Design a protein around this ligand. Structure first.
Ligand SMILES: Nc1nc2c(ncn2[C@@H]2O[C@H](COP(=O)(O)OP(=O)(O)O)[C@@H](O)[C@H]2O)c(=O)[nH]1
Length: 315
């Protein structure tokens, strides 16, 4: 019996990782469980096109054809029509006109300014597929949904003649997350990092950028007495998002002191070194890191297998 504690910031992928364990070692998401996620996939898409809409307002963006103005109005009229997984085709057509319009797209490339779900461009492009009345979410659709994680989430599976209990803490509040109870002991920690988060944009109240806050969280998690012989596994996740982001936005955004160039590999190893250098601990406590795209069931599968061989080597 192995104990995996799943720790990360917000929107870091932990529910995506749990959903991946249920896919990979459990039987996976049956059609019924997909059908439940119908309404999630819907309201994710709606809140997301709404998000970009409202942010056209504050970033001062216009609609490529002003014909879209009333389309905007109609959105908010039928925003709740999809309460019960019923996307009327009127609602569909509105979301398509809006997403296809230029100015909406301009605000969306600005994206990093107004904060919007990572799986937005996904559903929004594949909207034709989704808008069928009889559409069933693909497994990748369920993996793309953001449901926000309430209390303490648990998962039991078996792998390689070994029982595993995984716990997503979530908690939705950085101090409610305290739960040092679970902290005591624990086979292995899985700290998850939203790479794509470097270039995000400081809030008014926000002291440091998201990336730095996560680094502090990791520094306290690793350099903890409870996790001395805990195996520490860092997922530098959303490598796909981050890989896309380096082209348009420099890593100088997050770390200013970075004199290396804005390429995938340099920036990725520099973030890696940034996190790994927080460990003041022994040479017996060497952090194990992997770069990861948690929505890729195959990528996860392979990573997690190398992870288990690590955890085994400790016992
Ligand atoms: N496109 C993409 N989305 C990801 C990746 N990893 C996680 N996500 C998405 O990130 C969003 C936040 O993940 P979530 O499961 O809520 O993480 P949590 O905050 O730790 O519970 C979800 O919509 C996931 O679908 C990735 O590598 N690529």
């Amino acid at each position: 019996e192995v104990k995996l504690l799943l720790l990360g910031a917000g929107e870091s992928g932990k529910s995506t990782i749990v959903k991946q364990m249920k896919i990979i070692h459990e039987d996976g998401y049956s059609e019924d469980e997909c059908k439940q996620y119908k309404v999630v996939v819907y309201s994710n898409t709606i809140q997301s096109i709404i998000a970009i809409i409202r942010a056209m307002g504050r970033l001062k963006i216009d609609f490529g054809e002003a014909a879209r103005a009333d389309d905007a109005r109609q959105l908010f009229v039928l925003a709740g029509s999809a309460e019960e997984g019923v996307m009327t085709p009127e609602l569909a057509g509105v979301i398509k006109r809006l997403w296809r319009d230029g100015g909406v797209q301009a605000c969306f490339s600005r994206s990093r300014e107004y904060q919007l779900n990572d799986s937005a461009s996904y559903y929004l492009n594949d909207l034709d597929r989704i808008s069928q009345s009889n559409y069933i979410p693909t497994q990748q659709d369920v993996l793309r949904t953001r449901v926000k994680t309430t209390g303490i989430v648990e998962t039991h599976f078996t792998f390689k003649d070994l029982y595993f209990k995984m716990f997503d803490v979530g908690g939705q509040r950085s101090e409610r997350k305290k739960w040092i109870h679970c902290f005591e002991g624990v086979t292995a920690i899985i700290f998850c990092v939203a790479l794509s988060d470097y270039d995000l944009v400081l809030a008014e109240d926000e002291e440091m950028n998201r990336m730095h806050e996560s680094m502090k969280l990791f520094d306290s998690i690793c350099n903890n007495k409870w996790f001395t012989e805990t195996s520490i596994i860092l997922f530098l996740n959303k490598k796909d998002l981050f890989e896309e982001k380096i082209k348009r936005s420099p890593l100088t955004i997050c770390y200013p002191e970075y004199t290396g160039s804005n390429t995938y590999e340099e920036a990725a190893a520099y973030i890696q070194c940034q996190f790994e250098d927080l460990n003041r601990r022994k040479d017996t406590k060497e952090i194990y890191t992997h770069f990861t795209c948690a929505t890729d069931t195959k990528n996860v599968q392979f990573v997690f297998d190398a992870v288990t061989d690590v955890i085994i080597k400790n016992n």
